């Protein structure tokens, strides 16, 4: 917080977190087959490791480094590797201090509901840096979904200092009292635009951590508004949005005055669609 | 319907459907690495094919037989093969007349939300036979989940004649007007027991086809009862139950007088739990 | 033999064999993810099948088509699939009428020593057409290695008529009585150039079929010459050349007056190297 | 050499090497899904690691531990993992200080000809201990083939002290001057029995290291005897025996007075067969 800031887009912010965590703890290593700019020439071959293996091999490799006492951050697109990751997570649930960075344009669907696995997705340069630092420092296995569309823009102020965004905590990106709009990743910005173009007071909640979901924050917002819209760009069917709506339909139906709306991606949401949805629930 | 009946458990009923569909259409073939009793000695090596391949190979093999003009029924436990099946389904959605029988004790989770893929799960010897026949005759790729726990019992009357249970159609296993209890597979019987031990009139809806879900039937039942409980033995989180609840929370919240309850399996429901749930919603 | 001829390079010759075998037998199908030019627009979607599967899936698919009574020709680079192919071959050795075309620039190493698997590699447009036709008509599983370097040139006279080059038979590409030079694929041409630039009479033997090896022809040539040079472009260590030399060192050492020379590829032969080798054995 | 000895079979000797190398260097770790008796209760969870991954994952895991500065010994049967191992070896050839122990009853065929990969196979409790220690201490990746048939017997004197058997060096298991009998693993004992039941003086050469082959020792023996028999239990076709014979047929044909004999396993050698072979070459 205090100190110099970078006017950074998400890629630069991730680059900052990696550089910082690596300078900070000799144990942190980066691996995989740019967000990693300058790490190699600064930390060397034994800290920045080109892994000429297939995804499972890289995963195994990262796991081996972790068992050896290191804190690996592996990049894996999962194009596939989930089988191995999910099993490790289940076992832990039932040691794996690793972070898998995976660019997203579904790896989400495959991991978001996995027990023992932490799944996070940043939405700003600020929480991209903050969440990655938190993920790296934690001892829990984490899949870090990076919305490729946010890599280049927008650019915002990012403190170069030591700060993290706590894993498992959602944030109110915009206070409002008529409608709760639960979202994450690239859609947070769309939700914020829509928030600005409607009459109703819209509270935008950015989940940040997709698993474990911060239900308290969501419940708090819905108890106030009584109206819920959930929006994400990943596949709608069976997606995270379905679980959130289901949890609200059982645990908090008494607080709703309107139908729960899900706006999500094709199985194989725009600002206008979100606006129409706000207008719709405001009828109740 | 008319004719001789067998007092059969689910395994015998599946055995009947296979024998019948094979006698009926020379194109139907069975493959894989007992539900298949007598087929080999009756139809031979070119109709009953032992496939010494891994799951993907068998899937590919079945697909090859289909492209060749045959109607294959392959047994695959998926212990893994989903990758290949899901892609084929997406492609079709975006030819694959095959049926994959897979014993279940999660293959469900991995397929239930797939576009272009038909997923069914029988609950009685009667619909086990009926659904399999419908699946085999159809031209759509189908995953046929067989609850291993129902293989041996219970035994019920199963016509040996020509009948099918239509794909994509849920059934009201027990008429009732106070509570809609949506379920499938082995849990249907538990729902029926619970139905008998409560004061309230419970309508048990057996989905039969998990994808595509018969939402009309579910909506019809909930419009009447105003109370919904969804129960399945597969993993609750991200499961089919989450989608159903979510669809009801958006499309039919106006018909509910009670919270939507999901009773499902550990991520890694008993008669008593269902009873407690009925009692709970009856408070609303 | 009788009739119209095409001045064709290897790719055109393979294209001719496929077109001919497909026109000839409705059962012949082509599949995979140009040597296949015009087949689609001439035979259609059910004969020319784009298989959107991974290599194993395609292999399984081809196997499924074969079990269904068809004669598939699948293209697989093996970049992996060998595991499945080798097992099928072992099983047969210990039904699989398929042909796998695989471009080569090692799939050879992995298959050449497999029991029950036929492995062939053409060297001219003439035997490219002839061998492929023989492979397709046979009931044995065959891997057809196509030296990519020969696809475009050279061009030679290729009868469009019905002829095959028998599987399992080597050919004397050039009669000679001082040195036997065993080779195949692209190296046949290099052997022929060398043959023309030395004093000694060099007999060039083109194996054509790599498995099962035509040892009789090789023995006949070596009994006459007493000198043996074996040349191939695939990895030398553990390659086909090692087996040939070993078989000659046990079964025919009595006919040799010179050391057995192997000229082959890096584990990870030029005209000049072959010439030097001829000169060397001619010293004995 | 000096000191206490154990009357040990091969399994006990491997158990001794592991215990010793682990006591000796904190960096040595053992992993995989008994030869490992007592290690866990003596070195603990971070040194003796149960790896719940598939073979590739374990390989990757072992590689990750190595990159982290440790010296892993992983058990992998390869039932598959070779793809990954071979690539790493090629890359090194073109860091991987790991040892993969693999029981054998073909993993040999798949690795013996790989550039940059060390492949060894012990034949006695004495060299089982010695070679494993050498493999562990070296920085080269090694596949350690353990003939399952020798695990229980025979038992022989094994010094508990610090000694290794040098990688890449064959040994003369029995001096002789009429016939060179090249062998390894379980067949060494059979060769030694045969040596005792023939008139001829048979020199038994135990390769010990299969890759890189100690050709000097083999050449030295053959220059003396002029007769060569090569025997191994792995598949004969394309096996190590083929390379040895081929190397001798080119580099040392001038020293032979008899045909080079290979006695090996079915593609899918007894004391009597070896005896007949000795008798045969003694005719020359």
Short mmCIF file of C-alpha atoms in Angstrom, two decimals, chain C residues 5 7 15 41 67 75 82 91 94 107 112 117 120 143 166 179 181 200 234 244 265-266 276:
data_model
loop_
_atom_site.label_atom_id
_atom_site.label_comp_id
_atom_site.label_asym_id
_atom_site.label_seq_id
_atom_site.Cartn_x
_atom_site.Cartn_y
_atom_site.Cartn_z
CA UNK C 5 1.01 -44.79 -67.32
CA UNK C 7 4.69 -39.90 -64.84
CA UNK C 15 -2.88 -41.24 -54.47
CA UNK C 41 -15.23 -35.50 -53.76
CA UNK C 67 -14.36 -55.44 -37.27
CA UNK C 75 -3.02 -41.91 -41.58
CA UNK C 82 2.21 -47.71 -31.06
CA UNK C 91 -2.56 -60.68 -29.95
CA UNK C 94 -0.09 -65.03 -30.34
CA UNK C 107 7.94 -44.99 -36.00
CA UNK C 112 9.98 -53.04 -37.29
CA UNK C 117 2.86 -56.68 -37.51
CA UNK C 120 6.75 -51.90 -45.31
CA UNK C 143 2.32 -49.95 -41.05
CA UNK C 166 4.13 -58.65 -53.00
CA UNK C 179 29.16 -56.39 -52.95
CA UNK C 181 24.22 -53.45 -50.41
CA UNK C 200 33.26 -52.83 -58.01
CA UNK C 234 16.50 -44.44 -39.42
CA UNK C 244 20.10 -58.05 -40.40
CA UNK C 265 21.11 -42.55 -39.06
CA UNK C 266 22.08 -40.63 -35.93
CA UNK C 276 33.91 -45.38 -48.88
#
